[model samples]
Target chain A: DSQVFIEKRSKDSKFVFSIVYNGFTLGVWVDVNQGLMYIDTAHDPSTKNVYTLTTDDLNENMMLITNYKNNYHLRKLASAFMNGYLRFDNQVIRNIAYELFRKMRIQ
Target chain B: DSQVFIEKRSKDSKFVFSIVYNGFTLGVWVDVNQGLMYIDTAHDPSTKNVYTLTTDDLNENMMLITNYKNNYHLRKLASAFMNGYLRFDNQVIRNIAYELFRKMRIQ
Candidate 1:
């Protein structure tokens, strides 16, 4: 039970990647090495959040949601992925979003 | 750049699951629904932590790390997976742990 469902939704000007789970999805948008990320859709809300992943090629410090640096940050990125905080408006969050989990195990 | 390196090392008596990354690994042990998880090893430490995932099959209220409840919890789980807490002794932690990452994107 560890897996993810994703679909690419970007164009020439900017590249967008969306991960879908529980009827919701996160959008990753990149522009000129500058990125801007948003939840795109949240089931609930009342707050906003910000996240930055420094290792990303997106420079000028711009990449969207925006990213994570190390594995620890990766962990938070997953949580923030669900919470509207590492996100934008009207986003409802679950503690551990399993969409990332296909329900798959590795070896 | 998003990915994971893993090797499952669990045997009889207690089903132990181990995740490896950056020269470190986490062990998840389960016995009769009573699970005991630990960092198995850590690069550094001065403190320890605990985590719980309520929606898990490991019942009688025993899990290790122990686990997470929702997507938010999951975010933390991924992070904790890398950390020594939500674990046991002699563990070092990163902000986010990626052994969970498959170095793959999905749809």
Candidate 2:
């Protein structure tokens, strides 16, 4: 099973993570300052993906989350999604996102 | 003129902001842990809006930005969007988002 979770933290801010998917690995780093997240794919040395999300947007962002679910394998995507931060105070939304992962045992 | 920018920083992290729109004020706090953003509306003390955006989803989040443009007056909406953070390294996307606000003179 491919598992994604925070593996380490650098200086209490930058988060380092490992995402294993079906025998492949993805290195992740969560650097929040200007609000940036990065992923390095082990499957392809040339593959590097970075995403930017505004805290001002949520409902609109959910569709992209759906697409992420459709585009990637399974565990890798779930674990990647699980690694970053949430910019809202709603427990329902937090619960909702978490439950999606929890059901998959990815937490 | 309504200016939406970082007013102060607390101990190098939490951002405190003031959003002036059409003679109204909105207090904002950008706390980037667990990824949450909060807005306190001066238009109505009863109104408190909170949003959460995942770094995993970007395209969907842009739509919410469009909605923010549509729902709120000019300055306030622009400033709030300008404040928090950018989670991507693509200068094109960052430039695009910045240009929108730059044209408005929000940043």
- The lDDT values for all models are 0.31, 0.34
Please report how far candidate 2 places residue B47 from its true position, in Å: 16
In model 2, where do residues sit more than 4 Å from their true spots? A1-15, A21-24, A29-37, A43-107, B1-38, B44-107
Point out where model 1 deviates above 4 Å. Answer: A1-15, A19-26, A30-36, A41-79, A82-85, A91-107, B1-38, B41-48, B52-107
True contacts kept of each: 0.00, 0.00
- Candidate 2 per-residue lDDT, tens place, B1-107, comes to 22333133223233344334333444454455634334443223433343322234332222322343332333333323432332222344333334333323111
Top candidate when judged by TM-score against the true structure: 1
Docking class of 2: incorrect
> Clashes in candidate 2: how many?
12
Best candidate according to lDDT? 2
Tens-place lDDT per residue, model 1, A1-107, is 21122212234223234444333544433333323233344312222322222323333122112222423333333333333223332223222232232221210
Give interface RMSD, per candidate: 9.4, 16.7
Compared with the true structure, what per-residue lDDT tens digits does model 1 show for residues B52-85? 2222333312222122242333333333333322
